[model samples]
Target: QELVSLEGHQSAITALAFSKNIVVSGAADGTIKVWDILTGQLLRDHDGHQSEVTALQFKDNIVVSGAKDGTVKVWYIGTGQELVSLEGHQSAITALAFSKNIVVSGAADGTIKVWDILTGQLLRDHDGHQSEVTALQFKDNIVVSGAKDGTVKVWYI
Candidate 1:
């Protein structure tokens, strides 16, 4: 049985993250939408990314989004307000992961960056891989990344 059908994005959905009873999604149309899982209601419509939203994750009450415009943004899920823009990447964003109050991002520039989700501060930087970082995931104390360079890196926090 279908719980509910979500049908509001203008283009293909690229990123989806779940927290509590809500699902946050990003799409190629550069839009981010938060939906109520049980009711299938689009709660918040967040628009900030310049191009395709390539990566997305949410923790606590905030959502982090990365785009082809080479910027990562933090937004408040309650009000759909943009909280911060973490800028450092020189190429399109490829992956994003969030844990606790931290946000991690990987880009085509072959770099991985860690940020403070609340303060919007850059914490640590890594060379990541020789090519675009294509995949990323985070756990309680670990962050893992896969790249077009044909390698994977495991990080310990």
Candidate 2:
């Protein structure tokens, strides 16, 4: 569906995730706003990121966000509370994905980091690519990461 007449973000919007009738959005103003999809009503405006928000993901009531500040932060959708900031990478996060309680992020440093949402811990660091990671996906106990090096790696959990 075409988005019409929705004045949601002030600065530039960078990322989003859809859940039911809810639209979780991240903006260049370092704001993550939850929006009602149909009517474009405001649900919650989560100010969590330091600089520009680069990537975002949502599953159930949890929202995971990555920004130019090189950190992945988690939020509770029900409360809009900032829960965890998974920090490890040294550059801007370009890609993000989650499966269950696991969050996977790809950074400009060409590293893919796996984080556990429950404990807010860095579980694994996949650092084989020679260039920046451009995309990533987590599924079926495996994470597939793609890099600018023109290669894809499958990480097993």
Candidate 3:
């Protein structure tokens, strides 16, 4: 069954994630908005990124977002407050993953970076993708990435 359609994004939705009953969305309009999944009520609207949002993930009470502006940000869902902004990618961020206390970001710059989520510090940098990294996921110390270069890489960190 269809729940409810969210209606606040001024342009196309670029990234989305859900935790329990709350949904977080990012748009090409350079906005991030949180919603009540069941009622479709607009909750928190955040104007954080300067460009289109490309990647989003939610864990605990926090949301990790990556944008076409070449930056990654952490936000608190309940307060609609930005926790930290991380910058390292020379090009737009294409994929983002959050695990434990770390976030891994893959970018069009052909680089994958692991960061400390709260401290906004770069932990590791892996530069290998021939083109843009499009998808990413991690478990414990393992990171897997798929790229526009038509290859999938598994990194043991």
Candidate 4:
């Protein structure tokens, strides 16, 4: 695979993911960029957040990104166009994950939100942490979350 370099962030890339043949990168610049993995071609970039973009995940033709802006955005991977933005956090969005039709995001606001991946609608919000949520993962019917509060939570829904 060829490597494509992007030069816009004053900080560092916090997360990366590959979907199909495309590369999705999140940076501290509060922006996400899509690149052609094979050709290393810059495809598209989007910005709307106020802080760093921390995490990204891809499923099918959709891309999900989390940022320090306290928001999560869903994008159409093929056209490099934004589809929807999910917001409610009081702090930064630090982690995200996608599984089948569900998308989950973790934030420094100490909350985790579950969304319909296709519709970008909030399904539910889980709040049990005293600090920041740092990681999220979904597998089958279980969702796992980690927090700076020194705990890991598993949700069954």
Candidate 5:
């Protein structure tokens, strides 16, 4: 038999990330929910933001989420407990990505902030966009960000 659907978002899902055993979802509801991929179990729900959650990603056993509330949150995958909340943006957080020891987050505030994965310390903030940053990807020493201002910026860090 098929698993039953679990509906949590009042609007639309903005981002989805999958691990070998689980799925993490961010939505317009300003919350993040974790689900068991195989069993379809609703494992946990996390809330703190006041706007939409626009991006989600997982690294090892940690889950990272970005929201329109202008904050980024890190969670422990096993317990689903929030590990830390990083605050830097002036507007909404729109995108996020994680590399080996680095985290990159873009925001509707028109900037991208890089953080140390383990210590949750801010490494740098790159700013050049004329509008809201909406997406981000990290590859090697380069970081790419998409903006609502109709441009994609690349940074070498």
Candidate 6:
């Protein structure tokens, strides 16, 4: 059985993350939208990027997003507030993973960056692949990343 098919963005829905009984989506509309999973109701709409949003992940109240706008943003879900903007990549951001106070991001610049959420500090700038990074997942303090170079790297960040 299907639950609900929520819709509202004027452009493509680019990326999505689920947490705390809601879904946060990044769109080609240059915005992030939140929806109630069970009722198919739009809860919040916040413009977080200037272009297409490429990647997203969430846990509890925090949402981490990557975008073609070339930045990563940390969002506070309930208040519809963007807490921090992380910048370093020269090209589009393609992937992200968040856990507790840490966030890991990958970009078209062929680099992976580890950041501390609370202090907004870059903990590491790492290179393991030769091309654009495309995928990421976080578990506890471990992060796994995949790139267009056909390689996968794991980091305990």
Residues 23-78, candidate 1: write the lDDT tens digits: 99888989888899999988977775878998877778888888998888888888
Give me the overall lDDT of model 2.
0.84
Candidate 4's residue-wise lDDT over 63-141, tens digit each? 8877776777787887867787566467787778789888877778788888886666789878847888877778996
Flag the better candidate by lDDT, 1 or 6. 1
RMSD of 2: 1.8
Among all candidates shown, the one with the greatest lDDT:
3
Give one digit per residue, the lDDT tens place, for model 6 in 64-109: 8878867888878887787776775778888777777888888887
TM-score of each: 0.90, 0.91, 0.92, 0.87, 0.87, 0.88
lDDT tens digits by residue: candidate 2, 89-113: 7998889989998998888988888
User: What TM-score would you give candidate 4 relative to the actual structure?
Assistant: 0.87
lDDT by residue for model 5 (60-121), tens: 88888877767788879878777765765788877788888788888777888998867778
Clash pairs for candidate 5: none
lDDT at residue 136 of model 6 (Cα atoms): 84
**Model 2 ranges with Cα > 4 A deviation:** 1-5
Evaluated against the true structure, the overall lDDT of model 6 is 0.82
Error of 3 at 115 (Å): 0.7
Better of 1 and 2 by TM-score: 2
**Poorest 10 consecutive residues of model 4 by lDDT?**
1-10
Task: State the displacement of the C-alpha of residue 22, model 6, in Å, after optimal TM-score superposition.
Answer: 1.0
